[PDB]
DNA sequence: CGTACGTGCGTTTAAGCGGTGCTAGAGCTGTCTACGACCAATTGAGCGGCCTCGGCACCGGGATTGTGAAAAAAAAAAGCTGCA
């Protein structure tokens, strides 16, 4: 149920975040250097990346390890594919 | 392969120039004497000589450190799958 609501900037971090094949790794800047394959605004596209995140870490729907700036560490994790 | 550099635009900035006006201070002049050259006589600090004994160079033996191979693990990465 609920109100699921839309993203944008916050899609393009989960189609990259799954685009590297690995176990616990996806610094922003890592992030950054792949997406700026532009229609976007790149001058200012860090701080929306980094505002992005900050949420999908609160849903926990993406998954990080220990830090903030300084760990630049995360997946898409739980539990969701087309299921009943 | 990602981007830090070079290129070339238009916009902005202050260097450059020529000039005027002020005075700090560079430098020049003459005076006067404190200070350094020079001298000779005086003597002790430092030279060469020479003697010694303890630090230090060299050795052997035992302790310790670090390298490298070999065996075996942990992991990362590769090649291989069907699905959707
Ligand atoms: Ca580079
Ligand atoms: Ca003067
Ligand atoms: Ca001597």
Known sequence: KKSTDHPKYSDMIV??????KNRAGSSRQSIQ???????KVGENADSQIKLSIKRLVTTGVLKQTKGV???GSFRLAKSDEPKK
């Not at 189609?15 to 590297?20: D, K, L, R, S, V």
């Not at 250097?33 to 229609?39: A, P």
């Open 33 to 39: 250097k792949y997406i700026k394959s532009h229609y």
């Open 69 to 71: 700036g300084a760990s």
């Open 15 to 20: 189609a990259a975040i799954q685009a590297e």
